[PDB]
């Protein structure tokens, strides 16, 4: 198969290549496992392709060659003899500096896809990326697309390449955050996808009857959120006073993201999951903009975003698969928000643990959110069984007496033993003065109560 293709490529006829390579790409489109009997021939074909892109050829021939090379580059072994500086310069030249021409967009898209594959698969390409300064050129290309139209695919694959480079290398990650202005530019991209019109300094105008998003805007937003997560991984280590204004705009943009829906019910979950993942890196002191509006309503504030987060967690608990990678980020974010603020903690306490009225049932049996969170407290995994206990422990002002009422000593024994207090005590933090919140029926039934089990015999 590859022998005839290589011969006709070496022949040099322009028309014949555009048909032979297209047929080859059509036959092999969904193959990912390769056998070792066809290696050498394939390798030769690869080199032949790179020998024809140097000369001037029509655009369709370039597109076909790039499509074939994308398919060949999936296998890791072939790239070793064909990863050289001269070869990479051709791909960079094809990808890039005037965007006036309109028929050359597919060439750019295909070259970017090939670069993604090559950089992920091989190892020397990551070392050459530093030498060739790929990141700065990518950022310049991103800035060149501020106002133009028909630019969604180029932006999406540019962001994908930036995400891969940031993920696989640390020097490039450090170059983006502290130099090159990574945080503003990417933020602006998000602000352009959602079409945000600011009403106040950190507030946005939201309409309930707004039209749903589009698939391409969803993909651009997802890629931008992933890249922004990789840029700001080490942000919480050291925080200055000159960075607050930059993080508050990001928090406001994410709050506007949490209040819209995607095209289908499956993309919305991915969008909200990526937003929740990014929100775990912002410093805690800049998260108050989540309840920024002053008009669910609590104490004359707007609390729709916290309700959305709570519904997200409740729906994620229902399916019983992969609790480690599905419940840790959102629970950690909710605990961190509740520790430092006052309105959020009180709203969540009134929503999750209402005053007690049912005493003839055990805490574990039931279908309310309190029952699910109590059931999660005895789990084989350690991370889940610790974070689910800490979330409920925060809402009760870190008092043992208020925790044992709702859950029981049996379910809370693990958390009590971990923190070094197995008797009556309090946490390190002090929140405010204790008050009375007891329902009347409970006051009748308290003398005859079971502390270990948590219900009335």
């Amino acid at each position: 198969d590859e022998e005839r293709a290589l011969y006709i490529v070496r022949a040099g006829e322009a028309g014949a290549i555009e048909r032979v390579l297209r047929d080859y790409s059509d036959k092999h489109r969904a193959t990912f496992k390769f056998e070792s009997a066809d290696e050498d021939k394939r390798k030769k074909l690869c080199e032949g392709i790179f020998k024809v892109l140097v000369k001037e050829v029509p655009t369709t021939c370039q597109v076909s060659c790039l499509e074939v090379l994308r398919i060949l580059s999936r296998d890791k072994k072939i790239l070793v003899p064909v990863t050289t500086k001269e070869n990479m310069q051709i791909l960079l030249r094809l990808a890039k500096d005037s965007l006036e021409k309109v028929s050359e967009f597919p060439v750019i898209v295909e070259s970017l896809k090939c670069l993604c594959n090559i950089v992920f698969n091989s190892q020397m390409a990551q070392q050459l990326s530093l030498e060739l300064n790929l990141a700065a050129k990518l950022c310049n290309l991103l800035r060149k697309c501020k106002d133009r139209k028909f630019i969604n695919d180029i932006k999406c694959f540019d962001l994908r390449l930036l995400f891969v480079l940031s993920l696989l290398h640390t020097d490039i990650r450090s170059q983006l955050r502290y130099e090159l202005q990574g945080l503003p530019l990417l933020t602006q991209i998000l602000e352009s996808a959602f079409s945000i019109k600011w009403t106040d300094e950190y507030e946005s105008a939201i309409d309930h009857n707004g039209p749903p998003l589009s698939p391409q805007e969803t993909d651009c937003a997802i890629e931008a959120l992933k890249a922004l997560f990789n840029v700001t991984v080490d942000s919480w280590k050291v925080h200055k006073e000159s960075d607050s204004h930059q993080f508050r705009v990001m928090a406001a943009v994410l709050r506007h993201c949490l209040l819209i829906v995607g095209p289908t019910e499956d993309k919305t979950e991915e969008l909200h999951s990526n937003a929740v993942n990014l929100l775990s890196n912002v410093p805690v002191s800049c998260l108050d903009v989540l309840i920024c509006p002053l008009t669910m309503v609590y104490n004359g504030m707007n609390m729709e975003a916290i309700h959305v987060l709570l519904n997200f967690m409740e729906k994620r608990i229902d399916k019983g698969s992969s609790y480690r990678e599905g419940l840790t980020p959102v629970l950690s974010l909710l605990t961190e928000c509740s520790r430092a603020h006052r309105n959020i903690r009180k709203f969540l306490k009134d929503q999750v643990l209402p005053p007690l009225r049912d005493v003839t049932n055990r805490p574990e049996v039931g279908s309310t959110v309190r029952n699910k969170l109590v059931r999660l407290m005895t789990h084989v995994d350690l991370g889940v069984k610790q974070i689910a206990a800490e979330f409920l422990f925060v809402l009760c002002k870190e008092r043992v007496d208020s925790l044992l009422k709702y859950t029981g000593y049996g379910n809370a024994a693990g958390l009590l033993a971990a923190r070094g207090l197995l008797a009556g005590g309090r946490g390190d933090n002090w929140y405010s003065e204790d008050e009375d919140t007891d329902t009347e029926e409970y006051k009748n039934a308290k003398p005859n109560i079971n502390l270990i089990t948590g219900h009335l015999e």
């Binding site: 992920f120 993920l167 991984v233 990678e325 980020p329 950690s332 069984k385 693990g414």
Partner: protein
């Protein structure tokens, strides 16, 4: 008060019993059989027919290392490990579930509705998310 018999006033020797037994002693010779016998003796007594039991299973990391090493196998000491219905490395979760079930099957048999048993095993978010990002990447 609560009694600590491992191998609010807390005392070491009543409303509840706290019992702790190391879960990585199956290879050592065995001790896990002695622990199960003692647990079945305490649970089925008649003087204590309304008191619940809180069970702690510690030393998990040592068991993980021992089962990953492969020098000693479970089935050489616990022949019932074979023909066990399916529920990190896949050879650790099965061992942990089997160890927990050995204790759980003793309790479910008798005393239903008069007392209960609570078993407990005794930044990560960024590492979890980074690993998930690496594994899920799909080639174009």
């Amino acid at each position: 008060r609560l009694l600590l018999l491992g191998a609010f006033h807390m005392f070491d020797v009543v409303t509840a019993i706290i019992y702790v037994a190391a879960c990585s002693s199956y290879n050592m010779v065995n001790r896990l059989r002695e622990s199960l016998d003692l647990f079945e003796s305490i649970w089925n007594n008649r003087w204590l027919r309304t008191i619940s039991i809180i069970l702690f299973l510690n030393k998990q990391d040592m068991l993980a290392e021992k089962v990953l090493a492969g020098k000693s196998k479970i089935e050489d000491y616990f022949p019932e490990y074979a023909n066990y219905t399916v529920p990190e490395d896949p050879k650790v979760t099965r061992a942990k579930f089997f160890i927990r079930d050995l204790f759980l099957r003793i309790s479910t048999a008798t005393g239903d509705g008069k007392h209960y048993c609570y078993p407990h095993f005794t930044n990560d978010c960024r590492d979890i998310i980074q690993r998930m990002h690496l594994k899920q990447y799909e080639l174009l």
